[PDB]
Design a protein around this ligand. Structure first.
Ligand SMILES: *[C@@H]1O[C@H](CO[C@H]2O[C@@H](C)[C@@H](O)[C@@H](O)[C@@H]2O)[C@@H](O[C@@H]2O[C@H](CO)[C@@H](O[C@@H]3O[C@H](CO[C@H]4O[C@H](CO)[C@@H](O)[C@H](O)[C@@H]4O)[C@@H](O)[C@H](O[C@H]4O[C@H](CO)[C@@H](O)[C@H](O)[C@@H]4O)[C@@H]3O)[C@H](O)[C@H]2NC(C)=O)[C@H](O)[C@H]1NC(C)=O
Ligand SMILES: *[C@@H]1O[C@H](CO)[C@@H](O[C@@H]2O[C@H](CO)[C@@H](O[C@@H]3O[C@H](CO[C@H]4O[C@H](CO)[C@@H](O)[C@H](O)[C@@H]4O)[C@@H](O)[C@H](O[C@H]4O[C@H](CO)[C@@H](O)[C@H](O)[C@@H]4O)[C@@H]3O)[C@H](O)[C@H]2NC(C)=O)[C@H](O)[C@H]1NC(C)=O
Ligand SMILES: *[C@@H]1O[C@H](CO)[C@@H](O[C@@H]2O[C@H](CO)[C@@H](O[C@@H]3O[C@H](CO[C@H]4O[C@H](CO)[C@@H](O)[C@H](O)[C@@H]4O)[C@@H](O)[C@H](O[C@H]4O[C@H](CO)[C@@H](O)[C@H](O)[C@@H]4O)[C@@H]3O)[C@H](O)[C@H]2NC(C)=O)[C@H](O)[C@H]1NC(C)=O
Ligand SMILES: *[C@@H]1O[C@H](CO)[C@@H](O[C@@H]2O[C@H](CO)[C@@H](O[C@@H]3O[C@H](CO[C@H]4O[C@H](CO)[C@@H](O)[C@H](O)[C@@H]4O)[C@@H](O)[C@H](O[C@H]4O[C@H](CO)[C@@H](O)[C@H](O)[C@@H]4O)[C@@H]3O)[C@H](O)[C@H]2NC(C)=O)[C@H](O)[C@H]1NC(C)=O
Ligand SMILES: *[C@@H]1O[C@H](CO)[C@@H](O[C@@H]2O[C@H](CO)[C@@H](O[C@@H]3O[C@H](CO)[C@@H](O)[C@H](O)[C@@H]3O)[C@H](O)[C@H]2NC(C)=O)[C@H](O)[C@H]1NC(C)=O
Ligand SMILES: *[C@@H]1O[C@H](CO)[C@@H](O[C@@H]2O[C@H](CO)[C@@H](O[C@@H]3O[C@H](CO)[C@@H](O)[C@H](O)[C@@H]3O)[C@H](O)[C@H]2NC(C)=O)[C@H](O)[C@H]1NC(C)=O
Ligand SMILES: *[C@@H]1O[C@H](CO[C@H]2O[C@@H](C)[C@@H](O)[C@@H](O)[C@@H]2O)[C@@H](O[C@@H]2O[C@H](CO)[C@@H](O)[C@H](O)[C@H]2NC(C)=O)[C@H](O)[C@H]1NC(C)=O
Ligand SMILES: *[C@@H]1O[C@H](CO[C@H]2O[C@@H](C)[C@@H](O)[C@@H](O)[C@@H]2O)[C@@H](O[C@@H]2O[C@H](CO)[C@@H](O)[C@H](O)[C@H]2NC(C)=O)[C@H](O)[C@H]1NC(C)=O
Ligand SMILES: *[C@@H]1O[C@H](CO)[C@@H](O[C@@H]2O[C@H](CO)[C@@H](O)[C@H](O)[C@H]2NC(C)=O)[C@H](O)[C@H]1NC(C)=O
Ligand SMILES: *[C@@H]1O[C@H](CO)[C@@H](O[C@@H]2O[C@H](CO)[C@@H](O)[C@H](O)[C@H]2NC(C)=O)[C@H](O)[C@H]1NC(C)=O
Ligand SMILES: *[C@@H]1O[C@H](CO)[C@@H](O[C@@H]2O[C@H](CO)[C@@H](O)[C@H](O)[C@H]2NC(C)=O)[C@H](O)[C@H]1NC(C)=O
Ligand SMILES: *[C@@H]1O[C@H](CO)[C@@H](O[C@@H]2O[C@H](CO)[C@@H](O)[C@H](O)[C@H]2NC(C)=O)[C@H](O)[C@H]1NC(C)=O
Ligand SMILES: *[C@@H]1O[C@H](CO[C@H]2O[C@@H](C)[C@@H](O)[C@@H](O)[C@@H]2O)[C@@H](O)[C@H](O)[C@H]1NC(C)=O
Ligand SMILES: *[C@@H]1O[C@H](CO)[C@@H](O)[C@H](O)[C@H]1NC(C)=O
Lengths: 172, 325, 325, 172, 320, 172
């Protein structure tokens, strides 16, 4: 995909994450854990759910139309009736093929984007206190217990209070 | 390097979910790519029966719509009926005087779209002729009869006078008049029934007319008859007038059908009609209309998905599926 | 990082984008509604309420249909030799000559409309042994009984109406349109009075085509004193081909031909006024602006027109997502 | 948006930015300033200006066509005329709806991309002399007067001049 | 400097790129593109994939009726019948109401397979002929039609029947003669006014001749009008006439075909192609074509544009 | 492009890069060199190759249709035949124009995306041992001969081996 997160710098998905589409796993002195990210999950779902409704009109009633099957040959008028119907069908069949391919492309791209955006959001919070290990993992260079991990997850992490400690660990 | 994580460090990994069993979809980039979930957009299964719970469905059984309109005796049950959808069966048959309708398809369409056989008799006066002609080709009970809606006129005594009648439309809706001309099998038969060697039927309104001549000749027997009737129609708008002028061969109207601007139709199908819930009907039976597309039949009535050639189209409802290990 | 007064030896540089106080909502693939800085409406839903006379040559039919102007109904004499890009027919138009019908009226109307001219050239038809220039009280021109200007009503001379046989070659480089007709008398007495023969007939032919019409005697609804009718027909003669006319009665003869052009002209039914203004797109509702790609005013259009669609509004973003302060 | 810049790591837009779509605000010894970035602005405008014209012709010239309204009931030929017209209108209506949804998506995507591109370009210039504070703001760890800010804005900032000063400030 | 290294990332470019259009840009240069619209034809109709029948000087209808110069076309079949603009009729002058429909029905069926039937025409002269229709330099007539006239001083009411005991639909082509004068009418048919009734169990047609002059064509001011009747399995054809009948000699086999007819003046020759247009065969590699809206076979879609370029490579950004 | 790599932070293409669409140039103790990157190249080619086949059905046979050229003036039925054909052609012409513009946009975007991804991939490998110089170039702050460059090319570079050397060169 275009951002290179899903099936990219993140090696694979987690079958063990059932309460969210995106999330975190962490390891510190208190052990290992996992938690879903609700906002990224919701953003993706909102875009995907019933997405065709944005382009495909609510199905309306159609009633009497033209004949489309014929029991005898007639020539000119019947040729035209058949041609009109064949033409209509071919155009709608093309529309359907294109729409599905376009929508599917958009779905893959927007879910890859959410993954990358969550990663960039986390990177920015951490500032100089962590390094990108590759694989979508951060090495955090200070003591970072479950409450601290929690502050990263809910976006209230304060890099300033750990910076001195982190810089010394990173560079000495 | 230390095999044990320093207490003054932590690891935070970002990720996304996956499922054990993904499903394949097509994109602009990829012929096939596995996603966590997908949905089918094409309805390919029918209910195998026509549901009659939303639209008023009328089963024609052994009768075509046209024969029900004309009043073929075996179609008497259909008098004054109405429908959203009239179902015509392949096993329907005609059992009255042999006939044809130039532009049959148009009359069928007009009546089917109108959605009703509401007929009203009118007081036509047919001076100097015998009314209510009947034929062995058309039994009603064990008695020779005729289309209930038409009036087969013939000579009285030694003459058939020039018939000249009028019927104004002082109503607020279109009147549909059905009428005909009898085509004898020979000159002898023509003069026997109608006196004049050369019959004529002229049916007019203020701004339109239809002028018809009889066709004379031997034809293949149909229910004992070499003769034929050709059926015609005339729509008279409010404030207009119907005029009929004939010196022989006239198969007269007995009144008019009420024409409506309807949402009704007619459909050919041999599928049974039953109690069930559906808003879309095809010759194969009713179908679900949850999906935006269908591949069941190009012929549809109601609230229907669009017919397309494809039998399946899978829409991704989840991200790229990248399983573990 | 408190310090009320910023440090002289550092700087802050912020990157951003603009926003407006009042954004506008649009639809994307991703969102039902998203606010953007500005958008443009793509559907024209407003007409000028009048037809502009300044880009295309617009001809107001006033009280006349295009067909009546072609035939030369007296009250349409002002339309002789007219030409147009677009002929406007009003719903108040009426006929005021001998009552007539045209089988396939719609086709003749289309052909003339498209050609865009009533250029007519008289030809020296020789009508041996008949009286020319028949008139009717049904068709006054000024104070005199008259007839369609472009037709020539033939009747008996003396006590005879011989079999007419006339020709007219087309040595021009364009298709000639001939309009002609047949009189259906209301009675046998009138038939023999005018045409001697008890039954007339008209055959109009070319090298490769022929049309034969037999009159049908009888009453039609009284219209302007007449229970008889004229039926109108046409023949198009290609260069190098030749018109032949054969009749032993009831012929309403052509006087010449209309030049057919391969045109970019049309005809439109509208009751809105025509006026000075500039526009390149006309609908029955009036001229419309064509700056937008789509329109929801009318499916009937002429000229440089936006495409008709069912939606009354479609908003195209012309700016970024609007995120107000 | 897919880049997560607009309505993302940039918290909101600037109603006071009137001579460009994208730009800079800054504070240093000399005071506070604002300046539009003209290149990013033009790039976005060029792509948006008359974008529909790349796919649809403005208006097409048409003359005599079929009848579309009828005063009499006729059956078969009239049924066909009506069906042809309805078929055409539904197909174009679909085209219009999809086109507008696709083009609006593109406009949102490209404007978000330009914002991201300007941020990345600025980040690249600054090298080790600044940190991303989040919110689209850089802290520049050296004396950076109006002329210096100018050099960033015109892409001529030379990180090397200031690097020793910046590194000393960053790691204390 | 030995204590450092430089690693640059990049992408390729070509000296000579090509311009394409995107949603973003009217024109942008890419490394490579390909044309999607076929605008060139082979200038000839290839006859190797479909069975192509050259009509030469004959229309399909004239071949059907058996105009003498069309005799070579007897019992032919085709995927595509080609009519030339220089085709001409050379028999008795005729017209066919709904000509376009008959031509379509026959073109589609794809065969002129004809089978004579043993019609008995009691009391009339058969095999009428005309100076308008010469065969071997002698007066003749359409091979598939049988012009009946009086025998002695009589023309009895003809009344004949032909059952369809086959399992396919029969197509019967027949006609009526319109004489130029009352003298000719009575000379040929005795009766002052003729009549032809052709019917089955489900349809009937009755035609009355119209006497009079039409323009002279090959010595003739009279005309023949041509009609057709389809007889389904189990049905029966009946013909009833007291004069002016131009009788069928048998029937054409109708089949459900994938055949057609096309107007073209280009030569037919051996070559490789699966798509035919009036301009000649065209390659079908591309999805679109701007050669002709008239096509037969496996054909690219006709569009208005004469060129559409699809990028097959990245943006091209040449070195200085 | 939306990623701003091609015709962006990378100033121009390399005409001399003949064995790949994307690749590397490098200068070290052993001289200068160039190498193509196969995976990025293949990923772009695979998406571009026969891309229309994903949307456009394999051309199928059409046989008898309607007449589209007429030698006589006829009115109503002929008007309808001409209208039907014009309607069809205009709809397909629009489909063709849109498809090509959309597909071209997708090609431009995906190739820009691959360039960006290769850059980011390389950046993640180098960790704290290199700086982005701009122009798509990394300054690697340690002795990095051809085998070391090779380790970057095949994704096996181990930043820890050089980290002390590099950190010292960067921040002394
Ligand atoms: C890559 O290089 C291409 C090759 O062209 C070059 O060939 C090489 C070997 C060198 O000798 C070059 O000096 C030489 O130019 C470039 O392709 C060329 O591009 C130009 C447009 O930039 C095309 O011009 C057009 O020519 C038409 C002439 O008709 C035919 O003639 C040539 C033979 O000379 C045929 O091969 C072509 O296929 C043509 O069919 C002409 O009709 C066009 O006129 C219209 O447009 C101009 C404005 O551009 C306007 O003034 C005029 O009124 C018309 O409206 C037009 O002039 C040229 O055909 C084309 N040559 C070839 C062989 O394809 C290409 O630009 C370049 N790509 C890039 C990105 O630089
Ligand atoms: C022009 O030519 C046509 C074709 O020959 C003639 O039409 C035929 O006319 C005769 C009567 O004149 C018809 O013959 C009658 O058929 C009836 C129906 O047939 C049934 O049974 C047979 C089985 O043999 C089936 O084929 C068919 O499906 C029916 O179920 C019979 O009921 C009649 O039989 C009885 O009639 C005679 C008097 O004729 C009585 O005295 C006896 O009771 C006898 O049993 C009779 O055979 C025939 O059907 C017509 N054929 C067609 C195809 O229409 C025209 O008459 C002729 N025109 C002129 C002017 O000469
Ligand atoms: C077949 O059957 C039809 C239907 O009956 C007959 O057609 C009618 O024939 C009569 C006789 O010609 C027609 O009578 C005419 O009616 C006109 C009426 O038009 C309106 O205006 C008058 C007011 O004057 C109202 O009374 C009427 O309701 C209408 O609203 C009159 O204008 C004529 O009346 C008189 O006019 C002059 C004045 O200039 C008087 O001097 C004369 O006395 C004259 O009578 C005229 O009478 C009637 O309109 C026809 N009806 C229809 C529906 O067509 C056919 O005649 C008949 N055919 C045969 C062969 O018998
Ligand atoms: C109703 O009215 C029409 C119109 O007048 C009459 O039809 C004309 O009838 C005459 C008599 O048959 C026709 O005359 C013939 O014309 C032929 C065609 O002429 C063209 O080609 C010749 C080349 O030979 C050129 O000279 C000429 O420029 C034309 O381009 C001629 O070929 C005929 O000549 C041959 O026959 C005569 C017989 O008298 C011989 O003397 C000659 O040697 C030669 O072999 C002949 O002259 C004329 O074509 C008809 N015109 C049309 C338009 O049909 C009807 O007769 C009339 N009907 C009734 C009942 O009266
Ligand atoms: C520039 O773009 C065009 C895209 O059209 C490239 O040309 C295409 O190249 C491929 C591969 O060589 C050709 O496919 C081959 O076809 C043969 C037989 O038809 C088959 O045996 C091979 O297996 C292969 O599939 C393709 O036909 C050709 N298309 C056209 C229109 O020529 C070209 O390679 C590109 N140039 C560069 C430098 O990338
Ligand atoms: C496709 O069309 C070609 C060309 O029109 C056909 O080949 C031609 O067929 C004719 C008649 O069938 C050949 O005539 C024959 O030639 C010999 C001597 O060459 C002649 O003496 C015989 O009497 C015989 O008529 C002709 O050679 C040949 N012409 C050319 C130019 O090749 C071909 O039959 C058609 N193919 C298909 C599959 O329909
Ligand atoms: C990039 O900007 C620098 C310096 O900052 C400038 O910012 C500009 C946007 C403008 O407001 C300008 O007034 C301001 O100075 C330019 O370099 C400076 O140019 C001036 C006059 O040419 C000299 O007096 C300065 O000494 C000089 N500074 C340096 C360090 O050389 C520079 O011209 C400009 N570059 C380009 C290519 O536009
Ligand atoms: C990944 O690359 C390393 C680095 O060195 C190599 O660079 C390659 C791209 C290739 O061109 C090769 O010629 C060059 O040596 C490889 O390590 C080296 O591998 C070679 C054998 O292939 C040995 O001879 C060397 O001793 C060895 N040196 C070092 C320092 O490791 C490495 O094998 C290669 N691995 C994979 C999995 O691709
Ligand atoms: C619905 O009914 C139609 C009509 O028979 C079916 O369509 C036919 O499919 C068969 C089998 O493939 C073909 O022989 C015919 O070409 C089709 N049309 C006709 C008119 O016979 C269709 O398959 C049915 N769908 C069901 C039962 O789901
Ligand atoms: C926002 O967009 C609107 C279009 O929706 C612009 O207003 C139009 O401007 C054109 C050209 O100047 C005029 O012809 C129209 O009369 C205007 N329409 C409307 C509805 O106002 C407007 O220019 C844009 N506004 C800004 C601030 O950019
Ligand atoms: C449209 O048509 C023409 C100009 O194209 C104008 O008609 C003339 O102007 C006035 C109408 O206001 C009349 O007094 C003249 O007699 C007209 N000229 C002729 C030669 O007849 C007019 O401006 C426009 N509108 C109408 C209704 O005609
Ligand atoms: C194919 O032949 C047709 C004629 O059948 C050509 O269409 C003509 O094109 C010329 C210009 O080249 C126009 O002036 C004519 O008006 C067109 N005639 C018709 C009847 O449409 C067409 O150009 C040819 N196409 C080719 C050779 O690709
Ligand atoms: C933000 O996080 C702070 C850290 O502790 C909590 O993190 C939460 C995400 C949750 O998992 C708790 O169990 C942790 O204890 C917390 O003190 C703040 O209250 C949090 N604020 C909000 C609004 O979430
Ligand atoms: C936005 O609309 C408001 C109406 O609520 C009006 O006061 C004004 O025109 C606009 N506000 C601004 C700040 O432009």
């Amino acid at each position: 995909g275009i951002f290179g997160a899903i099936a990219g710098f993140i090696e694979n998905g987690w079958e063990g994450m059932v309460d969210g589409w995106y999330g975190f796993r962490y390891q510190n002195s208190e052990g290992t854990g996992q938690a879903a990210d609700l906002k990224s999950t919701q953003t993706a779902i909102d875009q995907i759910n019933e997405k065709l409704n944005r382009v495909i009109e609510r199905t309306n009633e159609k009633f009497h139309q033209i004949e489309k099957e014929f029991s005898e040959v007639e020539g000119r008028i019947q040729d035209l009736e058949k041609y009109v119907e064949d033409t209509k069908i071919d155009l709608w069949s093309y529309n359907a093929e294109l729409l599905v391919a376009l929508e599917n492309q958009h779905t893959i791209d927007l879910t890859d984007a959410e993954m990358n955006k969550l990663f960039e959001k986390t990177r920015r919070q951490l500032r100089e206190n962590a390094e990108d290990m590759g694989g979508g993992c951060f090495k955090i260079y200070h003591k970072c217990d479950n409450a601290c991990i929690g502050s990263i997850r809910n976006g209230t992490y304060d890099h300033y209070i750990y910076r001195d400690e982190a810089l010394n660990n990173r560079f000495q | 390097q230390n095999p044990i994580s320093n207490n003054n460090t932590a690891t935070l990994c970002l990720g996304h979910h996956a499922v054990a069993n993904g499903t394949l979809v097509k994109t602009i980039s990829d012929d096939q790519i596995e996603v966590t979930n997908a949905t089918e957009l094409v309805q390919s299964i029918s209910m195998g029966k026509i549901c009659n719970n939303s639209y008023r469905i009328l089963d024609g059984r052994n009768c075509t719509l046209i024969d029900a309109m004309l009043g073929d005796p075996h179609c008497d049950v259909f008098q004054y009926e109405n429908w959203d959808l009239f179902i015509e069966r392949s096993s329907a048959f005609s059992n009255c005087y042999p006939y044809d309708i130039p532009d049959y398809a148009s009359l069928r369409s007009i009546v089917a779209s109108s959605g009703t056989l509401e007929f009203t008799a009118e007081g036509f006066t047919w001076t100097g002729v015998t009314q209510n002609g009947r034929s062995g080709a058309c039994k009603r009970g064990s008695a020779d009869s005729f289309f209930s809606r038409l009036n087969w006129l013939t000579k009285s005594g030694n003459s058939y006078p020039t018939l000249n009648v009028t019927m104004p439309n002082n109503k607020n809706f279109d009147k549909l008049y059905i009428w005909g001309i009898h085509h004898p099998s020979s000159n002898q038969e023509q003069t026997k029934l109608y006196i004049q060697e050369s019959g004529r039927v002229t049916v007019s309104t203020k701004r339109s007319q239809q002028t018809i001549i009889p066709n004379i000749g031997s034809r293949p027997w149909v229910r004992g008859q070499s003769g034929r009737i050709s059926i015609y129609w005339t729509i008279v708008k409010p404030g207009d007038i119907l005029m009929i002028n004939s010196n022989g061969n006239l198969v007269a109207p007995r009144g008019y059908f009420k024409l409506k601007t309807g949402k009704s139709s007619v459909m050919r199908s041999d599928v049974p009609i039953d109690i069930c819930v559906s808003e879309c009907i095809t010759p194969n039976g009713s179908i679900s209309n949850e999906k935006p597309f269908q591949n069941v039949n190009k012929v549809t009535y109601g609230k229907c998905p669009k017919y397309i050639r494809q039998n399946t189209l899978k829409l991704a409802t989840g991200m790229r599926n990248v399983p573990e290990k």
